[PDB]
Structures are given as C-alpha cells and as structure tokens.
Amino acid sequence: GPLGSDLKDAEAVQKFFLEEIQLGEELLAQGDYEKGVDHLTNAIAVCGQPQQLLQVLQQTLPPPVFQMLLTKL
C-alpha cells in the first residue's frame, strides 16, 4: 500500500534520518559544506516536528552555512 501503511516504513525513515545526519556531519567535518547541507536538509525533510533540530543546527553551523541550509530547506 501507500508509504506509511506498513510497519517497516517507520523503521526505514528512522534509519534514513540517522544516516543523513551521520553523512551530513561527516561531510561537514571533512569540509564539504555543500554536500553536508544536502544531507542535513534531507534529514530535516522527513522529520515531523523539526523545531529543536533546526535550532541546534543554527547553533552549531557557521552562519553562512546555516544560510545555505535555509536555501535548501
């Protein structure tokens, strides 16, 4: 059936969110801000209530990189 109707859908999105945050932060740690933010915004995009995540991101990202995140939000 449609996405969300299978118990396995919840497990796949939880894994995806964690993967994207892990990949994003590795990329940012290597200096690839561009690709890092792509993955960070994928993570935010599947998060049902991303208030605290966004707030922590803006506290941990260089302001110019946070502005780029906003363009890809």
Binding site: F17, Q22, G24, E25, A43, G48, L53, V56, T60
Partner: peptide, 13 residues
C-alpha cells in the same frame, strides 16, 4: 567531528 550527529539525534523530531 562526525559524532556531532549525536546532538542532532538528541534534538530529534
């Protein structure tokens, strides 16, 4: 480093 991810996970959704 990359375990900064644990802060993002804690914030969660």
């Amino acid at each position: 480093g990359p375990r900064l991810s644990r802060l993002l996970s804690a914030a969660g959704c």
